[PDB]
Design a protein around this ligand. Sequence first.
Ligand SMILES: *[C@@H]1O[C@H](CO)[C@@H](O[C@@H]2O[C@H](CO)[C@@H](O[C@@H]3O[C@H](CO[C@H]4O[C@H](CO[C@H]5O[C@H](CO)[C@@H](O)[C@H](O)[C@@H]5O)[C@@H](O)[C@H](O[C@H]5O[C@H](CO)[C@@H](O)[C@H](O)[C@@H]5O)[C@@H]4O)[C@@H](O)[C@H](O[C@H]4O[C@H](CO)[C@@H](O)[C@H](O)[C@@H]4O)[C@@H]3O)[C@H](O)[C@H]2NC(C)=O)[C@H](O)[C@H]1NC(C)=O
Ligand SMILES: *[C@@H]1O[C@H](CO)[C@@H](O)[C@H](O)[C@H]1NC(C)=O
Length: 390
Amino acid sequence: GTINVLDHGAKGDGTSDDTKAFEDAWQVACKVAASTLLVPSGSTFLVGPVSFLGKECKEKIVFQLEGKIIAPTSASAWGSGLLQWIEFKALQGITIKGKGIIDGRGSVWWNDMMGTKMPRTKPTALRFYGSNGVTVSGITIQNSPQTHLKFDNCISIQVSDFTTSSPGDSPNTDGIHLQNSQDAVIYRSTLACGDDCISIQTGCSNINIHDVDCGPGHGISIGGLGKDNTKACVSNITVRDVTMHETTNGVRIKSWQGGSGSVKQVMFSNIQVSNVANPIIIDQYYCDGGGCHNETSAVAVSNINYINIKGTYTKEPVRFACSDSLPCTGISLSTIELKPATGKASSLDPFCWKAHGELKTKTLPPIQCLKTEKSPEAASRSNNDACHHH
Ligand SMILES: *[C@@H]1O[C@H](CO)[C@@H](O[C@@H]2O[C@H](CO)[C@@H](O[C@@H]3O[C@H](CO[C@H]4O[C@H](CO[C@H]5O[C@H](CO)[C@@H](O)[C@H](O)[C@@H]5O)[C@@H](O)[C@H](O[C@H]5O[C@H](CO)[C@@H](O)[C@H](O)[C@@H]5O)[C@@H]4O)[C@@H](O)[C@H](O[C@H]4O[C@H](CO)[C@@H](O)[C@H](O)[C@@H]4O)[C@@H]3O)[C@H](O)[C@H]2NC(C)=O)[C@H](O)[C@H]1NC(C)=O
Ligand SMILES: *[C@@H]1O[C@H](CO)[C@@H](O)[C@H](O)[C@H]1NC(C)=O
C-alpha cells in the first residue's frame, strides 16, 4: 500500500527535477489516514522548493525517507523567493522517518555560487509549520544552505536517531531551531553544525534535549532573545546527558539589550565539554549582526540551574553577563568541574555581572562572584515580562 514516488513520475536520477512527482505522491498520501509515502533506498531525487500542505490531509501520514533528496544548485532551478526548501505545514501526527538523507548541497550558497545575489537568511532545509504531533527520526540532513531543521508553531515534537552534518566553518548552519513551539523531546541525536547545534527561540516551552552529541558547532543556546526591542518568552527547558566537542559554547543563553519578557526554569545537567571556549554563558549584551548599545529593558533571566557539568575550556569558563537594569536571579550551580585546556585559559576567571544565585557545591574553578542577596531591581520590572502563557 506504500506510495513510492517512482510510481508517481519521479525519475530518481539526481538530475531530472522530481518536485512535481513528489507533490503528486503527496496528494495521494494526503487523502489516506496512516498512509506511507516512500522515497526509496537506492535512488537520489532532485527536488526543489516544495510544501507538503495538509490542513485537509488526514492524520498519521508517514513520509518514509530511505533514499536521498538533493537540492538544486542554481538560482534558476531553485525558483521564486529563495524563501524555503522542504516544508510540511498544518499536519496532525506527521512522521518523517527512515535512514535516508536530505542533502542541501549548501556549499553553492556558502561559496556565493548560486548565480544570484543571495538573501541574508538562506533557506532552511526542512521546516515544520503549524503542526500537532511531529516526529522526525532516523534521517540525516547534510550541507544545509543555512538551518538544517526548524519547528515553528508546532506542538508535540519528537526528534530521535537524527543527524546533522555540515562543516564546522560553514556559515550560519545551525542544527535544530525551535520557535513558538512546545512539548518537544530531542534525543539520541548527533549534531555537527557551523552554528548553534540547537537553538531555542521565543515562544518555546517544555523542550527536553537528552543523549545528544554536539560538535562542531556553537553549542546549545536559548536565543538570541528580544532583538529589535521585542518580547521573548521561554520556559521549562531541560538539557541532560549531552556532550559538546570543540564547540564555541557549551550551554548558552543570549539576549539583546531592549528586549522584554522572560526566560525561566532552565536545567542544564550532565554536560561534558571538551576543548569548548565558553562552557557556561548567559549574555544579555548579545549583539552579533546588529548594534551593540544598551537599553533600559531586558529579557528577565531567572531560575537557571547547572548541575554536573565537567570538562575543559579555552576562554572564560563561566560568564554571567546580565542586564544592569534587570539582574539575573535564581542562578544555581552544583557539581561543576571545569579545567583549563591551556596555561592561558587557567588565568581566565569566572565573570559575573549583575548575577544573583547560589553555589550548592564548591566548584572548579571557584565561582566567587554570584550575589546571594535578592534583587529588588529585577523584581521591580515584572510588568515587562508578561509571558502569561508561560
Ligand atoms: C553596556 O553596559 C555594560 C554594563 O554596564 C557596559 O559594560 C561594563 O563596562 C564596565 C566599565 O567599562 C565594566 O566594568 C569594568 O571592568 C573592568 C574589567 O573588569 C574585568 O577584568 C578585571 C581584570 O581581570 C583580568 O585580570 C585579573 C587579575 O586581576 C584576572 O584574574 C582575570 O581573570 C582577568 O584576566 C577583573 O578584575 C574584573 O573582575 C571583577 O569584576 C567581575 C565582574 O563583576 C567579577 O566577576 C570579578 O569577581 C571581579 O569582581 C573583570 O573580570 C575593570 O577593570 C573596571 O574596574 C575599575 O573600575 C571600577 C569602577 O568602574 C572600580 O570599582 C574598580 O576598582 C576598577 O578601578 C570595571 O569594573 C564591566 O565589566 C562591563 N560589563 C560587561 C558585562 O561588559 C558596557 O560598556 C555598556 N556598553 C555601552 C555601549 O554603553
Ligand atoms: C513548567 O513546568 C512547571 C512544573 O510542571 C510548572 O510549574 C510551570 O508552570 C510550567 N511552565 C510552563 C508550562 O510554561
